[PDB]
Symmetry: C3
Subunit: 378 residues, 3 copies
């Protein structure tokens, strides 16, 4: 490919610096003998180390699209470019155009290339994944809709890369965005829209009958009742088949699903999760749990709670529609007190960054003989 | 030991390459003088760096037994073996059998050995702990019995090493396997075993009296009552002794334990945790909390909830009885959509792996002047 | 500064070793030509790598004050000191006092300095952040007051640095210390202080009327009622302004705050959080949520639950008043079974360390053809 051809060029540059003097001026080489060959062996082993490490840490697909340029990868690519161009420039001007003797020094030049390219690989692992290992900052990530909030520690990242780690943790950690869980507050605010003084109106409101407390208690009671119906239905559904007419787990799932289908439908409607689980999805997860020997409760934990975003179908999450709002340049590093917002189509992740505080530890000595207790009351 | 003797050989190989030419042919050395000694100093400092780093990252006990071979450690050991054997081969064939001059080049050969062995140490830290730093995958780990589920991010690991990290997080994160919390569903399914049409039977079931809702509400009420009794008992037990007859925390624990013992026994029976806490364990934790100045609630948090597996006795967890079920080779790396199962004696951890999605970020500019609000209703 | 001047000296040491032979004895240099210049280029590129990596990982402020000396940073500074002093000593004794020829060897000496100083940078990243990447231990951190407990995995750290990571996770993860949530147990124990036999007294206590169960149920009911009042108040407060008299979010916050202020005050009093939120803090967070387009529930999640310590004001947490109690030297590494206590002014973090167990994995083969199921009951 494009980067693979440049990788082939940067890998064959020391090999070309070795091979060209015995080809272009074969009879002009000084007799090296031992030291040149013992340096070729070190060259080959260091190139093997470089190829294995480059495969291990950089033969992987691009993980994300960021708004501005990855500053550290641009720095590494500019450094590799100026590195290899300066070595080819010195090799063409001061070695090939002069047709040098002392081939041992040419092999030393190629081995210094391999050494400094290994240190470029080391600077790459320093910049790309070791600079943010030490947790310099904390990040409070809050959804703007339901208020679900988790805290994360991050090192020195840019606002781009911090937003990337926040979105990774969003798909892993936050429950999935459900707009149907949000409509009750919207209709309640619109019902207030249907109809000094602002403190007296609040006093008349707080003295009135709280419909919301009793409706939430009654809804929680209905959810517990539908949950108990669902648990009984899924237990008496799983008891209908045996691990051993012979059938595969898909047909066993289709066999036992009509004895749980109505209770699950009523539970997903009362918990407002019915848009998240098609019948095909439930049958695939049912055959999955029947295959792996999972209990009714282990099958049912997918449906009892909300669950994170990566449980669900790949279209229900949408990672290409993320927008990064920031008051400053997103290539700037994190610092104390900045706010950046990760906007999806309906919700947003409001992220404010706080510096992890300077902590002062001190010892104090507790004598283990000073742990004496008396039967007297305290 | 076995690996320690090979470590002594790989550490003494550059030193032997240095020491053998002034011993075997002492009068044949060309006068090096400055450059050889300034290269010995660099050799000694790089060997000190190599010894300190090798102690820091590899002088540690083997952490786990895996089914197949650790592929990266086997690659590193084969690389070290071919490395050192090729250097001894070139040193015996082309240096010792020829009895070379230009000892400066021999010291350069030994320093190139020390350099490439430092880069072997670097390739070791690349392969063993840096390749999986960037979180390529997410892992949904579910117990097959109670359905408890947590999500974890992992990089490029094999299925072996991913299963190892999953088990680390199992002992840290999941509540302990309690088979007594699972018997109610089993007896309920056996009670259904005591006694078109499959949809009508489900309709008659869901219209019947849900015993399960009222039994769960009544059990939760009994657990709250026993919890309140236990809190009162442990508070009035801790008030009987004073931090200051003089006694150590073991005898103070034995003094105040009979005023809390029955309430704790009834709470551990109602929460089905009585097999997990012997009287010796409770007395040791009681003397522990009396020693460290912990409150009754801080003592009691060990017993109120289930708690993770590493709270409990070392025989109650059993890390040697883990079985890895996978449809493919466990030395293969993680990829999107694979399922592997970690089976203990009674339960299993069903782990399905999902690729963390390709995320596209973009900026959008919000003018901070565009945050103007009106008192008008919305 | 102090460390910046020593950094300038260690950076200019190879440059000084290069520049001094053409200045002090200019006419005595042997003609190097190609190889010396091709080694200067490698020197300049490796010094650029060293400067970029040193900026990336070590140009950062000191994060914490520890009781005893950081052992690994002291080892690194002693190593750099003996390193650079030994190189200046050999350069003064055996190069400057002799006024050497073969300047190519002097450039090789300076390049070996730059190489071994890059490996010092590598040993620094090995000791300071790579030795603890592999999770050797688990840590149960419990507050002595309310018993809140979380488990953390750590590698080979000292007790100092483990305590530092524990405090990082304390400010991120534990809910904030609230002494007002603890006074009910203290007054209940003092009420027991107002008034064989120790088992009969416990039997008479556990048979009595449990005031605590009914008071906790009644308090939870009052908290749910005040929460419903607060949700209604904040929704009907946010509906009073529109995103668009024109006003900024501070004045919009001040406009809509008197219609929610009494319900929020009553909720913070019933949940004992009123010392944590001044009116200025609530108005700043209100203007913050009005700015970022957050819902009433997203505004309200700061106040509904306790929340971690870093949500609150910077004086409410106090990172300078931490005391480390340990039975051994805090520079010793973690091992299985040690207990260290992190004491704040009122509470303490009791941390006991357990070794993560030796896990034995094995394969077992499940035939995917062996997943056959029958319609027969099990």
């Amino acid at each position: 490919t494009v980067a693979s051809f440049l990788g082939l060029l940067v890998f064959l540059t020391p090999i070309a610096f070795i091979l060209l003097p015995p080809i272009l001026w074969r009879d002009e080489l000084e007799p090296c003998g031992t030291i040149c060959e013992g340096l070729f062996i070190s060259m080959a082993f260091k190139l093997l180390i470089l190829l294995i490490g480059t495969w291990a840490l950089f033969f992987r697909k691009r993980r994300a699209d960021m708004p501005r340029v990855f500053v550290f990868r641009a720095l590494l690519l500019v450094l590799i470019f100026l590195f290899v161009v300066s070595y080819w420039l010195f090799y063409g001007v001061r070695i090939l155009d002069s047709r040098d003797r002392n081939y041992q020094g040419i092999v030393q030049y190629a081995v210094s290339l391999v050494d400094a390219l290994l240190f470029i690989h080391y600077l790459a692992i320093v910049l790309l994944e070791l600079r943010q290992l030490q947790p310099m900052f904390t990040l409070q990530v809050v959804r703007s809709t339901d208020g679900e909030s988790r805290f994360y520690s991050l090192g020195h990242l840019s606002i781009q890369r911090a937003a990337l780690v926040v979105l990774e943790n969003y798909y892993k950690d936050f429950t999935i965005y459900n707009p149907n869980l949000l409509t009750a507050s919207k209709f309640r605010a619109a019902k207030h829209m249907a109809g000094a003084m602002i403190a007296a109106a609040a006093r008349r409101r707080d003295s009135s009958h709280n419909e919301l407390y009793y409706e939430e208690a009654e809804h929680e009671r209905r959810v517990k009742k539908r949950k108990a119906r669902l648990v009984v239905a899924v237990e008496e559904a799983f008891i209908h088949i045996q691990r051993l007419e012979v059938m595969d787990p898909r047909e066993a799932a289709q066999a036992i699903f009509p004895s749980m289908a109505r209770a699950l439908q009523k539970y997903l409607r009362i918990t407002r999760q019915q848009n998240y689980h098609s019948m095909e999805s439930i049958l695939q997860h049912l055959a999955f749990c029947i295959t792996n020997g999972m209990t009714p409760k282990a099958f049912l934990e997918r449906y009892l709670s909300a669950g994170p975003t990566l449980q669900y179908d790949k279209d229900r999450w949408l990672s290409t529609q993320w927008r990064l709002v920031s008051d400053e340049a997103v290539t700037n590093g994190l610092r104390d007190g900045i706010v950046f917002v990760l906007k999806c189509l309906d919700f947003s992740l409001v992220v404010n960054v706080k510096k992890i505080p300077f902590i002062i530890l001190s010892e104090e000595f507790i004598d283990p003989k000073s742990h004496k207790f008396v039967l007297r009351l305290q």
